[PDB]
Design a protein around this nucleic acid. Sequence first.
RNA 1: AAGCUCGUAUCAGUUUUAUGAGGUAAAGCGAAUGAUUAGAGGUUCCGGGGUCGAAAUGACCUUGACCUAUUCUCAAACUUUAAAUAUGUAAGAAGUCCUUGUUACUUAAUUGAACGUGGACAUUUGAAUGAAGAGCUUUUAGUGGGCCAUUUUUGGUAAGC
RNA 2: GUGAUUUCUGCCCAGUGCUCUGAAUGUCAAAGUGAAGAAAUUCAACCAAGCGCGGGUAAACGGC
RNA 3: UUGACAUUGUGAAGAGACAUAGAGGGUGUAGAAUAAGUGGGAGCUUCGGCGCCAGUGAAAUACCACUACCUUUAUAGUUUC
RNA 4: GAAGACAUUGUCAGGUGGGGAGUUUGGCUGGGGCGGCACAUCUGUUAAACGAUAACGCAGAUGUCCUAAGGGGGGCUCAUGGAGAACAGAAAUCUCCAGUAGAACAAAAGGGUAAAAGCCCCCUUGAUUUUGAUUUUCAGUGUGAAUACAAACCAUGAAAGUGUGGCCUAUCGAUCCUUUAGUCCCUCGGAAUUUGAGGCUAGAGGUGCCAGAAAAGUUACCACAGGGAUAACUGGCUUGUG
Lengths: 93, 427, 217
Amino acid sequence: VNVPKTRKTYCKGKTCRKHTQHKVTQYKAGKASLFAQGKRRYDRKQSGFGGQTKPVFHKKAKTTKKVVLRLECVKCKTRAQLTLKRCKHFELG
Amino acid sequence: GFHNVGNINMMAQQQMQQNRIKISVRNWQNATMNDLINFISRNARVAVYDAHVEGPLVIGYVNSKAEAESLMKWNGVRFASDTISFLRGVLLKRYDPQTKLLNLGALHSDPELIQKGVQSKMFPAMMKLASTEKSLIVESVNLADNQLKDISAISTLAQTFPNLKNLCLANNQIFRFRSLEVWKNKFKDLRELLMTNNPITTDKLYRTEMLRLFPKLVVLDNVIVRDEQKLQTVYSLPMKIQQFFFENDALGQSSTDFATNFLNLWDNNREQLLNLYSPQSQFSVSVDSTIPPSTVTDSDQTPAFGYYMSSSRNISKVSSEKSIQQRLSIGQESINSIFKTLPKTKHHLQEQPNEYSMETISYPQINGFVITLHGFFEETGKPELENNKLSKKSFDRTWVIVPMNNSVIIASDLLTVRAYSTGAWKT
Amino acid sequence: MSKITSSQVREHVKELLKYSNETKKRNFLETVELQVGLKNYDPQRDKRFSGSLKLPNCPRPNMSICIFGDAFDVDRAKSCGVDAMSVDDLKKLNKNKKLIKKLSKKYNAFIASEVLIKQVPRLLGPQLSKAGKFPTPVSHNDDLYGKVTDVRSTIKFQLKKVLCLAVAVGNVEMEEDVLVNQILMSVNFFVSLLKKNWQNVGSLVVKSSMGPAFRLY
RNA sequence: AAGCUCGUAUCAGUUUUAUGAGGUAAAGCGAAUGAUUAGAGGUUCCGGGGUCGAAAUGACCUUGACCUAUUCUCAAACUUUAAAUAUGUAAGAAGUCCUUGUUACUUAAUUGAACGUGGACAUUUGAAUGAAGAGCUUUUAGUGGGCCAUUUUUGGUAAGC
RNA sequence: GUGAUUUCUGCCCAGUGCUCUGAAUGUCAAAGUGAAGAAAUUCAACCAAGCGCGGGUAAACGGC
RNA sequence: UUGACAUUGUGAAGAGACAUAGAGGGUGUAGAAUAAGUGGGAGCUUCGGCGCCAGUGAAAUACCACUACCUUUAUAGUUUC
RNA sequence: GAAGACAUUGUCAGGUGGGGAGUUUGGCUGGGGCGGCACAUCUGUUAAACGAUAACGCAGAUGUCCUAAGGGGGGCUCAUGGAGAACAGAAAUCUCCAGUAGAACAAAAGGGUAAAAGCCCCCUUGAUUUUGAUUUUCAGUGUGAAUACAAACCAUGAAAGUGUGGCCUAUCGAUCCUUUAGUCCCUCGGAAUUUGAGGCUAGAGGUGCCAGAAAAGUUACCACAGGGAUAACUGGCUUGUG
Ligand SMILES: [Mg+2]
Ligand SMILES: [Mg+2]
Ligand SMILES: [Mg+2]
Ligand SMILES: [Mg+2]
Ligand SMILES: [Mg+2]
Ligand SMILES: [Mg+2]
Ligand SMILES: [Mg+2]
Ligand SMILES: [Mg+2]
Ligand SMILES: [Mg+2]
Ligand SMILES: [Mg+2]
Ligand SMILES: [Mg+2]
Ligand SMILES: [Mg+2]
Ligand SMILES: [Mg+2]
Ligand SMILES: [Mg+2]
Ligand SMILES: [Mg+2]
Ligand SMILES: [Mg+2]
Ligand SMILES: [Mg+2]
Ligand SMILES: [Mg+2]
Ligand SMILES: [Mg+2]
Ligand SMILES: [Mg+2]
């Protein structure tokens, strides 16, 4: 699918509150090790004797993924997110 | 679409840079060019290496895998337009200027052309070569038994050799007339044709359709199908024309003198129209909208004189009375108005005095003399009064001057805009 | 790199503009280029990244772009007063194989017709892209003078087998603050183009085309 | 099972009158859809792919494309008409009519829309028959293997399949 | 492992094993090293055996 | 089985990695030639000194332009083995 | 005598380790297994003229595709046949007449559509923000999909109008855990500043066994708790003639 990298939509910033122009990028993610409560809990549960202690998922069925767009306002610098359907090829031409 | 299948790629020129820049001192005893080409190809032709011998006992120009493998094998084993320059010369030799014609028969039995191993498109382009020769003049053609049942390769010869007069094409092998059917008004000035021992000449129509194929034929296969003694006076003019004539020779001399004087004065400055014309000497001016046949040589397509149409006192051009009355000429003031109405143009008569053609006569009603000259009038400058300017345009003055002891005084002052082409003076 | 308080580049640009024409008033060859060498990246192991980051500021006015096109863009190129080419001319150019390797040197670039550029791929054969002169297309309704201005002001960062990419980023003529803006734009484009957004860039140098000993970056 | 609020309600495994919806039986195909089945060639009218190939004047393969100059033939996944049986709603007081109050909705408006004040209309208050009181709430048991008969049907020659 | 005597026990090290008088970073943990940071930390280089590459072995399993 | 730390004390030689500085390497058939390097680079120097335009080349040269490493050195140190 | 700060011994770390330990080894089903998915869905039929209705019944589809193939406006008419026009020959381009759709509308099938929902152009981003109500499956829970308003901001058009993705019927996903967007937001509890962490509102990362465990065989050496198996009787068949 093709989506242009510019789009005029509504933004809910306190200064704008109207239809403004945004530019479009795609969303990605990160992670954290000596920070997050789940990781700090899992490591202590994992230490010692006993084995694995949590499930491990290996029965993947989907082959594609939904795509999320991040929109940044050119006059406000207030981002917004918008999800699309499942597609196999995506670009921002 | 365009030039697409030129074949500048697909292993011919690209991806030919897989060379290896190593120490280059390969095993090399004797690998030179002539013995290499002989030991490679003794039954066919081949394609050689980039730069491979054994003169210096070093070789690294085997830029491919099979190239390097064959080089290592012979290392480990001991071993040891362009035809136009002749075609146009043959055609110029065939166009002997004495006989004023070229013969194009039996070319498939001439060793200068049989061993050259090449015919239809060759003759259809040889028509273009003979038209672009322009200095090996050939009027008639001799191409009997040209191994064609049709007339495809001789179709453009009618357009390329438009000075055809005769043709001998006997022992033909044609069995139709539709290949010759395109020759109406094409090589129609030719006066001799016979292609006998054939199903195109032994038919019934050979006397009823050959005259249509060549209307201007003064002969028909060693005979006469038309009154050739009277055709020179009936199908053409009876007498010639005169590019300059008058009632008398001195009358033509004085008429050409006053005409060239008036044209030179109108070229330099026509501000003295009031001093050239009297109180009674009036004028007229008009323009020629429609034009002649399109095949007229160097002919103006349309009268691009759009800054002179309002003051044109032409009868059948405009439909009104008061409009032609205002556009028509009074005395000296409106004469100067018509003189500065159009675009000032230096007389192109001194270049072509021939194409500047002038007739003349007298006027018995006023003891005057008239002269109708016609030449070109190319206008660099125009009228300063407020597609717009002129083009290649001619002019014609039909003056009637009555002389005296001092000078001559005009009576009629005509202006005619026209469409410029060649003149009826030349031969 | 992440930007580093560009007053050092400001003093370097001032020293370069006092080197050119204030200690050697040479003939008009103003081109203050920025050379950038990257560090800690393998050419074969990493992806060969490239982009073009066209700043409208111009420094190379004398350029050669033999506009190859059809008839309408040939008349448009004759209007814009630039060296054009014809279809039979390009056919002869692909006929003579040695003429292409010379016409790639007598020109400085190229600008093609969105009606004949999908053929320069094969008709005008190789070594044009090896000399980095693949023509950029121009449409049937875009401005030819504007496209020539853009093809004279369009800079391109491409990753070769060497880590020493240099670009004619500015001229030594004038406009210190506009030159500072150009240096900021080039540094931003290189830092965003590299894999690590700050760490990979090592060497930055200014040189006003005269082998000047004033980099200070 | 415990009851609670009330006292003949406005309710019904039913009929009548009025008014909707349906596409099965039957008709009809021949009025447009009228079919699987074994169906002969016509190559640069198509060609699906599969194997090689320092690649393209590129070789090696076979289902099939398209029935070509064949119709009668009939349908649970075809249509023009169209039952019987079964099915939704209505048959008034929470109604009708007259008059004129509210509104930030609506109209060009003094128009409407919704909800009202005041007044008139009980021997039948708007078809039949019945009505063992009507309405409402809380809490909890067992069960969650079924089978047989007439009629209408689907798959298997067919069965107590 | 085979199973008195007599007679015959061919060819393959390729697959899986077992092995090593072979090359050198390809993968490469804790500890130690360096950089940025106010610091917790983050990033980077280096990196043992083993694995991988290379050689041996069938009266090893197999294969013909 | 392999590494680290501890047990754990006393000596001496060698071979290596990191910064500072110096010039060396850009030889295949060709083209004078010592070009697989990266874009500036057309005008600078009594010096024409190569250029572009000459040509061979895939890449052409002045101002030696930037990364270099690859074969090379010299300094003290950090650490290794 | 030999060896020597090396072995040895202690702690952590990386390999190797059925020698040993513990555990597991889906469901439907003319018995299991193989096959298939009738395990989550869609169209026609079975299905007997409201709705509902089974079978490892039948004929097929789904895990996609699209910045236009979404939205608004304007102009036009499609498949096909016939008669004509140089090369022209089943079939190339032009002209007229007939043409209720026999064409097209991404994909299965069914329905719908002619100054259009089809074809060709012009402008665009309503495939936007905030949250309630309703329909289908239904316990009238969740998930998916859809309908009609309200309060904003926009598009298109002269305008009335239309537009909350695809003409309609399918095209998809909890808790816990990560991550992102937004709130001059709340907390770190003796008091502050800055990192770090935790919360609130709204999305993505996925469970196809699709209301969602993390999982290989063999037993004839076998074990336990239970449930089922035995003459032919068609509610009436069997014998000589495709
Ligand atoms: Mg542990
Ligand atoms: Mg029937
Ligand atoms: Mg009342
Ligand atoms: Mg129960
Ligand atoms: Mg039970
Ligand atoms: Mg082996
Ligand atoms: Mg580590
Ligand atoms: Mg190792
Ligand atoms: Mg020790
Ligand atoms: Mg084990
Ligand atoms: Mg076990
Ligand atoms: Mg089972
Ligand atoms: Mg079974
Ligand atoms: Mg029904
Ligand atoms: Mg649509
Ligand atoms: Mg729902
Ligand atoms: Mg989720
Ligand atoms: Mg389940
Ligand atoms: Mg389930
Ligand atoms: Mg048992």
